[PDB]
Amino acid sequence: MVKQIESKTAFQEALDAAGDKLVVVDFSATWSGPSKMIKPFFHSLSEKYSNVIFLEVDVDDCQDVASECEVKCMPTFQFFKKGQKVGEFSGANKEKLEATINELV
Amino acid sequence: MVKQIESKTAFQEALDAAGDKLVVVDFSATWSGPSKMIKPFFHSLSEKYSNVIFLEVDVDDCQDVASECEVKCMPTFQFFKKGQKVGEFSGANKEKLEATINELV
Numbered sequence: 426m427v428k429q430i431e432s433k434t435a436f437q438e439a440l441d442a443a444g445d446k447l448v449v450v451d452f453s454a455t456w457s458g459p460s461k462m463i464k465p466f467f468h469s470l471s472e473k474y475s476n477v478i479f480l481e482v483d484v485d486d487c488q489d490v491a492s493e494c495e496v497k498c499m500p501t502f503q504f505f506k507k508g509q510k511v512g513e514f515s516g517a518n519k520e521k522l523e524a525t526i527n528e529l530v
Numbered sequence: 531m532v533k534q535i536e537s538k539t540a541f542q543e544a545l546d547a548a549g550d551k552l553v554v555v556d557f558s559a560t561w562s563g564p565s566k567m568i569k570p571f572f573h574s575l576s577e578k579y580s581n582v583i584f585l586e587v588d589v590d591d592c593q594d595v596a597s598e599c600e601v602k603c604m605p606t607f608q609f610f611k612k613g614q615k616v617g618e619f620s621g622a623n624k625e626k627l628e629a630t631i632n633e634l635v
Contacts, residue, residue, distance in 0.1 A: 454589075499601075
């Protein structure tokens with residue numbers, strides 16, 4: 426389900442609990458039109474792929490997590506497998522989001 | 531001098547008062563490493579070019595202005611001449627910022 430992240434602690438704990446699973450993180454902001462547009466599709470992907478963990482990090486709630494992960498653009502999707510960042514892109518491209526999930530799972 | 535913008539009213543008023551002058555607007559966020567890095571250089575450009583107006587808009591203070599202007603990335607520089615947007619780029623590239631100011635003034 427999309428797990429809403431509200432601290433650096435919660436983010437680190439989620440990346441540890443995932444084990445072997447792909448984690449897809451949506452970095453979003455309330456002021457981005459692109460971030461809102463893709464947010465229902467992000468949520469449908471989490472009901473479609475049960476074996477992938479989907480996290481949401483609002484960059485204004487979690488400014489230390491946004492700065493640590495070096496987010497530049499809104500939205501940014503970063504992909505992690507066992508604590509290592511294994512992919513990243515920015516922009517609201519639905520096809521590329523699902524295509525990267527399939528490449529990486 | 532870099533004029534700090536804290537409302538949509540203030541932004542619209544500044545773009546009207548500039549008359550014929552180039553206006554360079556820095557859209558920044560506190561969570562962006564790139565936005566902090568370029569911020570002293572942005573400020574030196576405003577003491578170097580007296581005939582250009584330099585505005586700063588923090589995207590979390592002014593979320594309606596950030597959403598109207600369709601800011602995607604941090605920092606974004608938009609350039610305006612007589613209320614019309616005449617250029618834009620994102621990223622902390624010092625040389626390209628000054629080079630665009632020279633192309634447009």
